[PDB]
Design a protein around this ligand. Structure first.
Ligand SMILES: CCCCCCCCCCCCCCCCCC(=O)OC[C@H](CO[C@@H]1O[C@H](CO)[C@H](O)[C@H](O)[C@H]1O)OC(=O)CCCCCCCCCCCCCCCCC
Ligand SMILES: CCCCCCCCCCCCCCCC(=O)OC[C@H](CO[C@@H]1O[C@H](CS(=O)(=O)O)[C@@H](O)[C@H](O)[C@H]1O)OC(=O)CCCCCCCCCCCCCCC
Ligand SMILES: CC[C@H](CC[C@@H](C)[C@H]1CC[C@H]2[C@@H]3CC=C4C[C@@H](O)CC[C@]4(C)[C@H]3CC[C@]12C)C(C)C
Lengths: 50, 117, 59, 35, 180, 33, 188, 346
């Protein structure tokens, strides 16, 4: 995000395709398959269903 | 000027300053010992060679110097210790003849293990 | 504690001279930067002499 | 990299450049206080 | 805002606790093979003194579920915007008190980790009630946590710009200069 | 002599000087004064 | 003002440290072992710093700051920058190559004192003592390092009771490595 | 001693005179291969069998300051006091309990409380061991008051002890100070059944199949021993904490506790064993590098049947500290009664 705003000269918001490309590729395929296990093992026990 | 001389002085000053700051960091957190300073006193005293004890007594009884006469007194003590160590290197010590010098520099004898315990 | 500092500095320099002089037994010297005819062999491009003139399995 | 960076020739160039630099700095301030 | 999310999540969790508590007869306690084959209540069945207990817990969970649904679809305009301040008390304090009970539960040595349909929604709804006390305590605008996101994003951006210009490539080199 | 190490010590290795170093020594002592 | 902060926080930190004194000396070992080998940096940051980090230089710096002898540090660092000056220039004179078979033969019969395999592992500098500087025989070609009172060099022969009548099969002690005159041969 | 302290193994020249060629003896010695390790000593099976380590592990449990909750975040609320394991003599476990409760349905054997009173009263006969290790930082005053409150209720709420009858005197033979008679006791005429029967004719005839003539002591000897046990426990704040100076405390000066004199180190282990006749054995061991582990013998009291019964019926009794390890240990004490051995060293 920092480098994209510096280069293109504007921040990627959900109105732009850059934000969605970053979101999908980066977030969903690099951090989500692990942060999912993290939340499934740390925050969901607090709520009702285990 | 002469970077070849500046760099070693630079690194020496760096590490020595770090040592000083560490000593300060250790004397405030862990305050100094009141009497084991005498332990270190005497245990840095004990390794002073004999050729210097002649001025140590001269340091006790008043007639040390003004500030300059000692700084030319201990010089000859340093030098006679120097030549004595040179003779111990070449011709050996006082209780040691050439056969024992050849023994010592050939590393022929082991350190006594039975006498250790 | 000044007298000890002075006499031990004296014997320290003396031990340094003992090491740099002859067979002293426990002391570590210090080395110097060498600024002179440094290595003398990179001054030369001798490939044409050694390979006797007078990369296809790669790509 | 450092053995190439601190070669004697580069050392002498650094030294001469720094000498002329400090010289011109102090000379400029000398002529500037002289105004 | 996070008030709506809070209450609707308490809705979902309590209704699922009901749908899993009123549809099954009972779970079974592990036998712990070889545990004092005589007395000490081991290698037995659960009693008719706890099924009604489970149904009472489920009924209380349903009443607080419907209460949360009422408050949620009432204060969705956040008709009375300020009357619920009374039931606010009832909706939060007891909840926290609830947790207190469960917070003393390991002290009493009661086991809550083995069974599913009893203490799960217990701790869930209790912590969610404390969190609603939070939502009313610091009043998340639903755009303030987004502001914290933006704050940490700006800080990390200023970190990576420095890292770039110091260890990768100078910003004076990468960017084009003009006038000549 | 059975339990001696055969690896002498980091210390008991005496110094030995190369040619350039004996030249350095001879200069620094000939013009000691 | 900084000394005012030191004198203020020192008494507080001293008591807090002396309180536990059990984790405050294993946190020390964890921190020092983590700073020596920077082997934590990949999963922490994404930059595997262990490949450009030098443990030995750091350990030498720690020792030179703890015993206040900068040589222990400097003497090391200097031969890192000045590594081309330390290639052997004494026992190598001209075309001082040996052959792979000659080197193998010298190796099998125990005439090689020190083998120095280099970085690429495809080049070596064999070190072979002069034949008279190998054993402690009192040959009048070795410098008189070790002498008797009556100034006669010492020798350490033993006549091999199993195979006498042949001097080359006798037993004798070996000379300290720092007293040998050595050829330094090259080999691919 | 200097030779033994180091590791250097030296081959032996052949007594055959020709060449003095060292023999292929060598040896890996899996007890030697295991130094430098931390937890235990991997042993390649049979080697541990030929070492007579006849105490197979039976159950693992944990003393929790507060057991962990599934619901709160990650179960960090779980704080464990100690990590305890138990062991019991396997040959004797096959000998006594295997001759009576063996040959039936395992579930049916464990299902009746006769087996429960069996494993309760015949425990101290097996020389059962409990090895509980420190899992965190422990100040001695804290865990000491904890232990007092822990063994008070087990001291109060227990009945007279059930003890066997001593058939043979087992006098010592001072001139033979490492000879033991149990091989002769099993192989006296090669028909030791009849001689053993006419020998127990004097003392008593056994009460059941395995061969024990039980004798639960009467009204008296059931409170005097309990009073002496309460006294021995009354010496805990005095023996553990004598006076205000740690410099004279027995814990200072060795790595089982910190140098500060008021905390016990993690990895510290306590071993408990119970002889038949009310005798207690207790040892300690600071863990870590197997190459320098320090074992310590604490005390050896005798006749204290009350504390022996308290320990056995507290670890495995009707209301133990954790019924899970009690159940597991009873079932795994059943499993070798069929003949085999857990940690199968055959
Ligand atoms: C916290 C730990 C950091 C200590 C401070 C480091 C000071 C930074 C100055 C040099 C660090 C450079 C570095 O990270 O690159 C790592 C450097 C450079 O790395 C070397 O670079 C060479 C270039 O010719 C080659 O490429 C080598 O392959 C590469 O390893 O390597 C080392 O210096 C290893 C660290 C040794 C540190 C010893 C102490 C250094 C002095 C510390 C200052 C005292 C502070 C009080
Ligand atoms: C924590 C978060 C991240 C922080 C990162 C901080 C910096 C991390 C990288 C530092 C080390 C970089 C590297 O490994 O060195 C690679 C290069 C060598 O170049 C290289 O040299 C190489 C050959 S060699 O290494 O010289 O032998 C060669 O392979 C290569 O092509 C060439 O580029 O080394 C340097 O440029 C840095 C030397 C360190 C400078 C010391 C301070 C300056 C004092 C002046 C005297
Ligand atoms: C409920 C305690 C449980 C483990 C069992 C330990 C704490 C018990 C078993 C044997 C006992 C000692 C027998 C004789 C001695 C010697 C005497 O001087 C003072 C009393 C003392 C220590 C006795 C008291 C402490 C000892 C060790 C733990 C795990 C909860």
């Amino acid at each position: 995000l920092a480098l994209l705003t510096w280069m293109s000269g504007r921040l990627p918001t959900p109105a732009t395709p850059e934000f969605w490309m970053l979101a999908y590729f980066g977030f969903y395929r690099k951090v989500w398959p692990d942060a999912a296990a993290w939340l499934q093992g740390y925050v969901v026990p607090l709520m009702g269903f285990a | 000027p002469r970077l070849a001389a500046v760099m070693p002085d630079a690194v020496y000053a760096l590490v020595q300053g770090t040592h000083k700051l560490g000593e300060y960091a250790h004397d405030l957190v862990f305050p100094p010992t009141p009497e084991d300073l005498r332990k270190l006193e005497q245990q840095v005293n004990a390794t002073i060679p004999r050729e210097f004890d002649r001025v140590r007594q001269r340091y006790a009884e008043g007639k040390i110097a003004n500030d300059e006469q000692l700084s030319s007194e201990l010089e000859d003590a340093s030098f006679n210790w120097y030549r004595r160590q040179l003779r111990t290197s070449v011709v050996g010590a006082t209780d040691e003849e050439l056969e024992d010098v050849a023994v010592r520099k050939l590393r022929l004898e082991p350190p006594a293990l039975q006498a250790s315990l | 504690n000044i007298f000890s500092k002075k006499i031990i500095s004296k014997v320290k320099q003396k031990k340094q001279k003992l090491n740099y002089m002859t067979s002293y037994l426990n002391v570590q010297s210090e080395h110097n930067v060498k600024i002179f005819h440094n290595s003398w062999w990179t001054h030369l491009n001798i490939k044409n002499l050694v390979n006797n003139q007078d990369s296809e399995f790669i790509n | 990299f450092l053995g190439w960076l601190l070669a004697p020739g580069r050392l002498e160039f650094y030294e001469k450049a720094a000498c002329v630099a400090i010289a011109l700095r102090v000379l400029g301030i000398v002529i500037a206080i002289s105004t | 805002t996070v008030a709506g999310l809070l209450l609707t999540t308490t809705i979902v969790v309590s209704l699922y606790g009901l749908f899993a508590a009123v549809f099954a007869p009972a779970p079974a306690l592990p036998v712990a093979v070889g545990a004092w084959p005589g007395t000490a209540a081991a290698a037995a069945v659960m009693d008719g003194s706890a099924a009604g207990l489970r149904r009472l817990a489920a009924g209380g969970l349903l009443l607080t579920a419907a209460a949360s649904h009422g408050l949620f679809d009432f204060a969705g305009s956040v008709p009375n915007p300020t009357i619920y301040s009374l039931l606010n008390l009832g909706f939060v304090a007891a909840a926290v008190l609830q947790s207190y009970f469960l917070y003393i539960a390991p002290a009493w040595g009661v086991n809550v980790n083995w069974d599913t349909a009893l203490w799960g929604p217990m701790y869930g709804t209790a912590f969610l009630g404390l969190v609603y006390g939070l939502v009313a305590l610091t009043k998340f605008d639903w755009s303030s946590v987004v502001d914290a996101v933006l704050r940490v994003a700006c800080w990390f951006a200023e970190l990576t710009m420095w890292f770039w210009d110091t260890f990768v490539w100078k910003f004076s080199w990468s960017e084009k200069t003009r006038r000549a | 002599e059975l339990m001696r190490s055969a690896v002498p010590a980091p210390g008991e290795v005496p110094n030995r000087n190369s040619r350039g170093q004996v030249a350095e020594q001879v200069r620094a002592i000939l013009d000691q004064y | 003002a900084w000394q005012q902060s030191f004198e203020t926080y020192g008494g507080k930190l001293r008591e807090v440290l002396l309180g536990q004194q059990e984790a405050a000396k294993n946190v020390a070992k964890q921190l020092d072992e983590g700073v020596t080998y920077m082997d934590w940096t990949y999963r922490s940051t994404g930059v595997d710093l262990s490949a450009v980090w030098d443990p030995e230089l750091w350990i030498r710096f720690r020792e030179a700051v703890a015993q206040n002898e900068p040589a222990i540090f400097w003497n090391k660092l200097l031969d890192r920058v000045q590594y081309k000056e330390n290639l052997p220039q004494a026992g190598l004179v001209g075309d001082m190559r040996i052959s792979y078979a000659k080197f193998l033969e010298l190796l099998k019969d125990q005439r090689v004192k020190r083998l120095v395999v280099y970085g690429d592992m495809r080049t070596a500098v064999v070190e072979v003592p002069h034949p008279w500087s190998a054993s402690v025989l009192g040959h009048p070609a070795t410098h008189p390092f070790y002498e008797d009172s009556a100034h006669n060099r010492v020798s350490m022969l033993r006549p091999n009771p199993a195979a006498p009548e042949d001097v080359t099969q006798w037993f004798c002690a070996e000379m300290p490595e720092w007293d040998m005159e050595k050829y330094r041969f090259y080999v691919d | 001693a200097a030779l033994a302290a180091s590791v250097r193994r030296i081959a032996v020249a052949d007594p055959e005179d020709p060449a003095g060629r060292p023999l292929p003896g060598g040896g890996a010695s899996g007890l030697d291969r295991s130094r430098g390790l931390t937890g235990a000593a991997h042993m390649s099976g049979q080697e541990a069998e030929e070492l007579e380590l006849d105490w197979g592990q039976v159950g693992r449990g944990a003393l929790w300051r507060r057991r962990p909750t599934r619901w709160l975040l990650g179960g960090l609320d779980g704080v464990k006091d100690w990590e305890l394991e138990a062991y019991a003599h396997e040959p004797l476990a096959n000998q006594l309990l295997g001759a009576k409760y063996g040959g039936r349905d395992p579930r049916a054997v464990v299902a009746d409380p006769a087996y429960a009173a069996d494993v309760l009263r015949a425990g101290p006969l097996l020389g059962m061991t409990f090895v509980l290790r420190a899992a965190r930082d422990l100040p001695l005053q804290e865990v000491a008051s904890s232990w007092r409150g822990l063994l008070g209720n087990y001291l109060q709420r227990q009945a007279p002890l059930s003890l066997p009858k001593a058939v043979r005197p087992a006098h010592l033979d001072p001139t033979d100070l490492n000879g033991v008679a149990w091989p002769a006791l099993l192989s006296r005429p090669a028909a030791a059944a009849h001689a053993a029967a006419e020998a127990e004719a004097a003392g008593a005839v056994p009460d059941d199949e395995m061969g024990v003539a039980w004798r639960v002591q009467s009204g008296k000897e059931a409170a005097a021993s309990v009073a002496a046990a309460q006294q021995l426990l009354q010496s805990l704040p005095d023996a553990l904490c004598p006076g205000p100076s740690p410099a004279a405390w027995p814990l200072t000066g060795t790595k089982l506790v910190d140098e500060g004199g008021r905390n016990w180190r993690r990895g510290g282990s306590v071993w408990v064993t119970l002889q038949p006749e009310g005798g207690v054995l207790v040892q300690a061991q600071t863990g870590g590098v197997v190459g320098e582990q320090e074992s310590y013998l604490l005390t050896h009291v005798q006749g204290q049947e009350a504390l022996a019964g308290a320990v056995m019926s507290a670890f495995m009794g009707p209301q133990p500290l954790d019924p899970e390890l009690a159940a597991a240990a009873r079932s795994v004490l059943l499993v070798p009664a069929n003949g085999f051995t857990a940690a199968n060293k055959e």
